[PDB]
Amino acid sequence: PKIPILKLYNCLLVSIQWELDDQTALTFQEDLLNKIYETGANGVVIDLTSVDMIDSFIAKVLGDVITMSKLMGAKVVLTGIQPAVAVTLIELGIALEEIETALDLEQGLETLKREL
Amino acid sequence: KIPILKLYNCLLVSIQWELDDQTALTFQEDLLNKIYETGANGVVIDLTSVDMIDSFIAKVLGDVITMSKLMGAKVVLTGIQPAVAVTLIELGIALEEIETALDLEQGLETLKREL
């Protein structure tokens, strides 16, 4: 079940809306970077509003895809992190300081535009 | 399930899968619910990645557009492929009422302009 990526002008929009799977997150990390490279988008906003909990594997995947996307030249934003997910990100801890984070998808896109 | 994004007062659904008849009704049921929950005035359905479609799914696509109008939301279809265009015409669903655009951004633009 590939997770979709939306291209809106110069931004990539992602919304995860189900329990993530180790095998799925790896495909998502693989797919997002290709989409950045194929489209040359300036910014990505990843929505985890519908993600109840995550594992350490996903946490590392999520942290790496933020770091990798920035290297390819795209500023990244996370939105909708729930308390359960926030705890696991802190506990590894993949709460990278350079994580620009937002409360909601709209706000993240707003923050994304003002950064650029 | 098919994910649906909410940007301000608009719904963006992109179908990057291969949709069977089972998924289409799930989509129809979920989209009409999403409008009612969100209070969205417009929705953009991107069919750019849909290689082909069948007559049954064609019909649900036409019903979704017309049903969402009744709820008060405007529907724009984007990225329809030639193969899909043949099937849509074949059923006769293709009406002047269907508002359509080439890609998601143009479809979203057409939406804001008419609201």
Residue numbers in the entry:
A (entry chain A): 4 to 119
B (entry chain B): 5 to 119
Task: Provide the authors' own sentences about this structure as they appear in the paper.
Cubic crystals belonging to space group I23 were grown under diverse precipitant conditions, such as NaCl, ethanol and polyethylene glycol 8000. Diffraction data were collected to 3.1 Å resolution. Thus, the structure of RsbS was determined by the single-wavelength anomalous dispersion (SAD) method using a crystal of selenomethionine-labeled RsbS. In addition, a β-strand at the N-terminus (β0) interacted with β1 in the manner of an antiparallel β-sheet. In a structural comparison using DALI, RsbS showed high structural similarity to mtSTAS and to Geobacillus stearothermophilus SpoIIAB (gsSpoIIAB), both of which are agonists of antisigma factors. mtSTAS and gsSpoIIAB superimposed onto RsbS with RMSD values of 1.6 and 1.9 Å for 112 Cα positions, respectively [Fig. 1(c)], indicating that RsbS has the conserved fold of the STAS domain. The RsbS crystal contains five monomers in the asymmetric unit. Interface 1 was associated with the formation of the asymmetric unit. A pentameric ring in the asymmetric unit was formed by tandem ‘head-to-tail’ interactions of five RsbS monomers [Fig. 2(b)]. A surface area of 663 Å2 was buried in the binding interface. Interface 2 mediated the interaction between two RsbS pentamers generated by crystallographic symmetry [Fig. 2(b)].
